[PDB]
Amino acid sequence: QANLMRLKSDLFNRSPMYPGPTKDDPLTVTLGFFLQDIVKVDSSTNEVDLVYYERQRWKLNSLMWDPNEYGNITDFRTSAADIWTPDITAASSTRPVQVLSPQIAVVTHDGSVMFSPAQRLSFMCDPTGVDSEEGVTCAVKFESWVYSGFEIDLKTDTDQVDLSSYYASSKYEILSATQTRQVQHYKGTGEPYIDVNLVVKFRERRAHHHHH
Amino acid sequence: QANLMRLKSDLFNRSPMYPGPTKDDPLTVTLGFFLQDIVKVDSSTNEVDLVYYERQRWKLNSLMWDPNEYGNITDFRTSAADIWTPDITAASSTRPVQVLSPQIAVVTHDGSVMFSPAQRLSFMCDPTGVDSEEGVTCAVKFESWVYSGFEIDLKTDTDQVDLSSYYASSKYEILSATQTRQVQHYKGTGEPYIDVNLVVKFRERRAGGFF
Amino acid sequence: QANLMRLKSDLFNRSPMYPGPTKDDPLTVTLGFFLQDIVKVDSSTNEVDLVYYERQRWKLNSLMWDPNEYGNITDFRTSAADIWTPDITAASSTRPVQVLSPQIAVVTHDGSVMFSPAQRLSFMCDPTGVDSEEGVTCAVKFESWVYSGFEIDLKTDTDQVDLSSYYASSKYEILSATQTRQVQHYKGTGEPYIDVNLVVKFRERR
Amino acid sequence: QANLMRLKSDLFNRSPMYPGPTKDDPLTVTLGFFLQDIVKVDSSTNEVDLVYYERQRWKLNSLMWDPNEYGNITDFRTSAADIWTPDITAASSTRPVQVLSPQIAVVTHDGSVMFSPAQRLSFMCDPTGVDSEEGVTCAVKFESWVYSGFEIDLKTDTDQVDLSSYYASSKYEILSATQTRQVQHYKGTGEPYIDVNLVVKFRERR
Amino acid sequence: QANLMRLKSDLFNRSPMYPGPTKDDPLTVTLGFFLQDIVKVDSSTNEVDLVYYERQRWKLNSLMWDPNEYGNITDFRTSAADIWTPDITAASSTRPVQVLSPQIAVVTHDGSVMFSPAQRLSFMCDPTGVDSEEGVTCAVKFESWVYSGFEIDLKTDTDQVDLSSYYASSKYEILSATQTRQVQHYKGTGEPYIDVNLVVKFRERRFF
Ligand SMILES: [Cl-]
Ligand SMILES: [Cl-]
Ligand SMILES: [Cl-]
Ligand SMILES: [Cl-]
Ligand SMILES: [Cl-]
C-alpha cells in the first residue's frame, strides 16, 4: 500500500501528464479486438450493434520506474484519468460509444500501458442478406480522430479478431472477423493517417445485520 | 456529529486513498447477490434484464480506528467517492449498468467496508424455451476487469442467490439461482483470475408446474 | 444580498457539511407524496411509471441562526449540493429515478430543511386487472438504502397521498392512494429499518 | 479581449455569485416563449412533446459596470455557470427537459441578463380530438420550483406566444398559443407563487 | 514531450482563456460539413437523423507562438476544454446533439484552431416523398446561438457539402447537398446574424 502510494505520487504529482505525441516524439499504439456479440441488426436504419473489448498498448519513458526502489512493484492499476490515453474513434459510429468496463489501466515498470475498454457500438451496416448462407459483411475503421500518421501509428499483433469470448448462443454466427492496418489520407490537408479496419462477416445462426 | 467529523477528517484528509491491491498486498472481496426481478427478455437480440443488489465486503488496515478515541463510534456511512471500491464487472453485459441506489458505503472500526449497489443489468442470454415447464438457463460472470487472481480474490458466503426480495408478481418465476466462485485464465497472459458466476434458471409464470 | 451572502458563508464555509446521523444522534425525516400522474403501464414487463413530487423535511442544529444577526432573514434557498440530503430510495425501482425539478432546498432559521424533488419512477407492478372496475393495486417502499432505524426514522404528516395536482385527464383514475410508515427488519430479523409504503389503487378511466 | 478579461475578472472573481432573491430583495423575471414545433403526441400515455426556446430576462445591480471604464463594452457573452439563473420549471413535465442550446447568457452594462434556453419538453396532455377541426387544447405552467411570490415574480411582455420560428411543415398546426401570468397558492404553506401558463391549441395539419 | 509541456503551460496556465469575440474584436469562423449518413427518417414526427462531422476553423493572436522557441513545434493537439470554441448550434434540432468524436482540437503556431466534431443530429424535416424519384428536400441552419453578426461571422470555403465519407450502403441516396452562408435578422433587436444553411436533397435507395 505504502510503496504504491509513493510510486503513484512520484509518477503523477511531481511531473505533469504526458501531453500527447508530436512529430519529433511520435507514439505507436497497438490494438486488438475481442468481439463478444452482435447484439442487434436494424434493417430499417442500416445500423448494427457490436459488443467487444479493445486491447490498447503503448509505452512512455515518463512512466518508467525501478522496481527495487518501490518494494519490487512491477506493475499497478490506476484510473485512466491519471494518464494520457489515445483518442481511438470508430469513424462510422451512429451513436456515442457506451462504456461497459471500468476506466482503469495497467501500468508496468518499463512504462508500458495496457487499457482494455469494453464497448457497445452502433455503426453503419446494411444487414440485407444476413438471413442467408453467405451472410453479410460490414466494416468499421478505428483511428485517432486528431493525430496524423506523423504523430500516431496504429498496429496489430495479428490480423485475426479474437472470438474466444464470442457469445456461443448469439443470434449471429461469425464467419470471418479481421483487423487490418491501413494507410489513409485526409481531404483538405493531404497528410497521412492510420486506421485499423474491423471487417466482420456474419449471418443468422443455423447448422446487527443490515443492507437494503 | 463532532466525533464523526473528526473521524472522517482523520481517515480521509490526512492520508491519500487506498491505491488498490498488489501482488505483495492482495485483497479478498466477498460478493452476494440479491435478485429482485427479471424485468425483460428480448428474443430478437438475446438480451435479458435483471434488477438486483450486490453486497460487497472487503477490509483495509488504513480504515481502522479505536472507537474509544471517537465517542464510541463503531461504524459510519460515507459517500463511495471518499474510498476505493472494487471494479466488479458483469463480463457479458450489453449496456452500461444502471445504478438504482445511492453510492454510499458503510465503514466499520476494524476497517471493514460494506457496499451494496442496486443495479439494472442487460446481459447476453438466449431466452428460447422460457415459455415452457423446463424454462431456460442463463449465466453471467462477475469479475474484476483489471486485476488478476494474484491481486484480487472473490468469494461468496453461500452459493445460493438470495430470493427473499424477488418480486412475487414478476413475469418470470425463478426455478434456481446460484452464485459460484470459479477460477479462470486469461487468453494472451495465461495468469489466473477469479469470477463469481451467477446462474439463473427461470420461466414464464404459470399456475402450477410439472404435474 | 449582502446579509444572505454572510449567512451562507457562515453556515457552509466555516464548518464542514453534516456527516449524516449516528446511533447517538439519530435523525427524523418526514415524507409526503404528491402524485401527479400514472404515465405508463407495461403488462409485458410488469413495470409502471409514476410522476410525483416528494416533500422531505428534517432539522439540524448546525443550520440554525438568529434572524436578528442577518437582517431579519428567516429562510433561504440554496443548491442541494451545499447540504446533506437523505438517501431516500424506492426499493422496487427498475430504472434510475429521473429528476424533474431543480436540486434546490429551502432552509429556515430554526434549522429546518425542506426539499421537494419531482421524480419519474419506474417500479415493479403487475397491472393485470387495470382495465376492470376493481382496478389493480401496486406498492413501492421508500427507505434509506444505507441507514437502519437506529440512525434514520421516517414518518408522514398524513397517511393520505395528496392528489390535488393529479392530472385530471390521466389515462388512469386513482381509487385510493396511501403513504404508511412501516417497521421492518433486515432479512431473518436483523436490526430494524423504517420505510414509507406508497400503495396506489387505480384503473383505466369512462 | 483584454478589456473584457478585466470586466469578467472584476464581476466574477472579486465578489461571490448572486445568492438568489429574498423577501427584502425580490427579483422580477420576464419570460417569453418561442414555440418551434409540436414534435410528438402519444395518445396511449397522454404525453406531448414541444420544442421551443424561452427568453428569460432579469436585472442585478451587482452586474452593473461603466462602459467608459472597460473600452466602451456595453454587453458580453458568458457561460451560464458564471452567474445565477432562475429555476424556471415546467410543472407538469414527464421527463427531464432536454437542452438544445448552449448554456450561455448575455449581460448588459446596466446589469440586465438575457438567457434564452432552447428546450425539448414532454408534458401531460390528453391529445384526444387532435385529428378534428376544433383540435385540442393543452396547458403547462412554468414556475420557480422553490421560490414563492414574495421572492420571485414572473412577468411577460405579451400574452401571445411567438410563432415566427414555428416549423412550417409540422404535423401539427397551431390555432392559438398564449402565455399568461397567474397567481397561485401552495398546499401546505398557503403563501402565493407565480406561474406563466402556456396554453396551446392545435390540431393535425390539413 | 518537454517542449510541448512548456508550450501548453505558457499558452494555458499563464494567461486566462479567450473570452469570446466583441464588437471591437470580432471573429470569423469557417465551417465545412462532411455528411456521412442519413440514419433515420420518422414520418410520424417529422424528424430526420444525420451523422456528419463539421470542420470549424478560426484564428486568435493569443494562441500564436514562435516554433524556434519550442523545439520547432508547428502544431499540437489538446483537449477542447483548454480553449474557447464557438457555440455553433443547429437551429431546428429536436434532441440534444450527440457527440461521436473526441473533444480535441488542433492548434497551429500562427494561432489557427481546427476543431472537427462528429455529431448525430435529429432535426425538423417532413420526409413525405422520400420514397419517390424526386425525393425530398430538408434544411437546417447552423448559427451561433448568442453572438450577432457584429461579433461572429460564419463562412464556408465551398458551397458543396463533402460526400466523400457518405455511407455507400445508406438507406438514403444523396441527390444534392449544399452549405450556404446567409444573413438573417433577430426579431426584438433587429441587428444581423449569420447562419450556414445545410440543404440536403435525398431519397430512399433503389437499371432493372
Ligand atoms: Cl501519462
Ligand atoms: Cl480507502
Ligand atoms: Cl448540512
Ligand atoms: Cl450573478
Ligand atoms: Cl482560447
Author numbering:
A (entry chain C): 20 to 226, 245 to 249
B (entry chain B): 20 to 227, 229 to 231
C (entry chain A), D (entry chain E): 20 to 225
E (entry chain D): 20 to 225, 230 to 231
From the paper:
Protein-engineering methods have been exploited to produce a surrogate system for the extracellular neurotransmitter-binding site of a heteromeric human ligand-gated ion channel, the glycine receptor. Acetylcholine-binding protein is a highly conserved ortholog of the pLGIC extracellular ligand-binding domain (ECD) with properties similar to nAChR. Mutations affecting key residues in the orthosteric agonist site at the α1(−)/β(+) interface affect the potency of both activation by glycine and inhibition by strychnine. We therefore set out to generate a high-fidelity surrogate of this α1(−)/β(+) orthosteric binding site using the 2α1:3β stoich­iometry [Fig. 1(a)] by exploiting protein-engineering methods and the thermal stability of acetylcholine-binding protein from Aplysia californica (AcAChBP). Ultimately, the highly stable AcAChBP framework has allowed us to introduce nine amino-acid substitutions that have resulted in a stable surrogate for a heteromeric neurotransmitter site that binds glycine.
Variants I and II presented structural features consistent with site-directed mutagenesis and electrophysiological data that suggest interacting roles for specific residues. However, our structures also emphasized that accurately replicating the α(−)/β(+) heteromeric site required changes to the β(+) side loop C, where the major differences between α-form and β-form sequences occur. Single-site substitutions were not obvious and we judged it necessary to make a major change, with four substitutions being incorporated (S206K, C207G, C208T and P209G). However, variant III co-crystallized with glycine and the ligand occupies four of the five orthosteric binding sites in the asymmetric unit. With this proof of binding we named variant III glycine-binding protein (GBP). One edge of the Tyr205 side chain helps to form one side of the binding site, with the hydroxyl group placed to donate a hydrogen bond to the carbonyl of Tyr166 (not shown), thereby linking two segments, and to accept a hydrogen bond from the glycine ligand. Tyr212 is aligned with Tyr205, creating a π-electron-rich region to interact with the glycine amino group. Solvent-mediated interactions link the Tyr212 hydroxyl with the carboxylate of Glu162 (not shown), which in turn interacts with the glycine amino group. The glycine is tucked between and participates in van der Waals interactions with the edge of Tyr205 and the face of the Trp164 indole. The glycine carboxylate is directed towards the Arg74 guanidinyl moiety, but the distances (≥3.8 Å) are too long to represent direct hydrogen-bonding interactions and a solvent-mediated association is noted.
